[PDB]
Design a protein around this ligand. Sequence first.
Ligand SMILES: Cc1cc2nc3c(=O)[nH]c(=O)nc-3n(C[C@H](O)[C@H](O)[C@H](O)COP(=O)(O)O)c2cc1C
Ligand SMILES: Cc1cc2nc3c(=O)[nH]c(=O)nc-3n(C[C@H](O)[C@H](O)[C@H](O)COP(=O)(O)O)c2cc1C
Lengths: 178, 165
Amino acid sequence: MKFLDQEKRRQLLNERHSCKMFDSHYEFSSTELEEIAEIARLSPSSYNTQPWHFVMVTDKDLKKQIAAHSYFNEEMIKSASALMVVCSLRPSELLPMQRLESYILEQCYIAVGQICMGVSLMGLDSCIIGGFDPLKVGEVLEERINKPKIACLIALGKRVAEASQKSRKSKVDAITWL
Amino acid sequence: MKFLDQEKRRQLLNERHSCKMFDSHYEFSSTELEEIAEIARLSPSSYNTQPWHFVMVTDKDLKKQIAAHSYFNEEMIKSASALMVVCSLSYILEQCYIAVGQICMGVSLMGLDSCIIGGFDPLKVGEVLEERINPKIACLIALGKRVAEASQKSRKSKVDAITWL
Ligand SMILES: Cc1cc2nc3c(=O)[nH]c(=O)nc-3n(C[C@H](O)[C@H](O)[C@H](O)COP(=O)(O)O)c2cc1C
Ligand SMILES: Cc1cc2nc3c(=O)[nH]c(=O)nc-3n(C[C@H](O)[C@H](O)[C@H](O)COP(=O)(O)O)c2cc1C
């Protein structure tokens, strides 16, 4: 019951890459945005806690304000069709270095791994972003939504340039066979 | 262009499910084993740090041992074709979980099945392995072939999960 053959499954692993620049002229349809939200939502988590909230930022000025405080990621964020803000839930909403906080981030990180695979399946591109001023991006999103704890960002869109070459430590360093 | 069309992308997200029991007859080829390991290795991380190590358990006797300490996951793990032990070497040491999500998606693309496992005793699971590896064990992933259909998706509302800006 496979979906893609070896050649295709291998290509996807390479197409899943950190897209450093996006086609600013490519706009996300409601269909594209909705499926991405479903890829995020349908992700797995321990005891199905789903301690995440995904904020889809498509407004250019609002994304631009976040971009201005993402340092070297500014032009990239600006270029992107959409910017996902992966928010971690409060521990008070979870229950009916901090242990609960780290647990929640672990679930959020899983979702991220699923999302970026989904984005490649559609034919689009992403870049996970942790290089940003956390206090400042919260600031410009405060009046819009309650002050969130941000795990990471995910820039989204269509690429202008080809995928960068994969650089990973040796199969030996990463894999033990038993 | 697309790798898969709309229907098949939507189908996959349901095929990507926590498989509770596996075909205890089915055995992983080397080719199946090697892809699963490469999906894991090509995962993304901060500054390409790759703060992880993946241990592939296939031997039925050693897997049987790990399953004995896996509480309510005992039969599942014994019946699986393989068992991956995911280990970590801001905060960056949690980013092995980014791999986890990529792996399970890649596994389902092959038309196989997986279950992410957090229900185990890390003391005794680490003990039976420590004659070889130096941990830190984050979680487990059972890998193999299903015996029945994928479970129904239960999730909180789209409204609970998504803010549209
Ligand atoms: C970190 C982690 C640990 C998990 N541990 C277990 C487990 O010990 N036992 C189990 O039955 N399921 C476990 N699961 C599976 C979740 O219960 C499952 O992801 C959730 O119910 C969503 O359903 P789905 O994966 O079938 O789509 C775990 C999932 C994650 C992400
Ligand atoms: C938590 C996290 C944060 C990241 N932040 C950035 C970033 O701020 N800027 C950037 O260009 N890439 C960022 N990346 C992408 C990684 O640098 C990239 O995944 C790694 O170099 C491997 O390359 P690849 O994904 O293209 O295979 C981030 C990745 C992760 C997991």
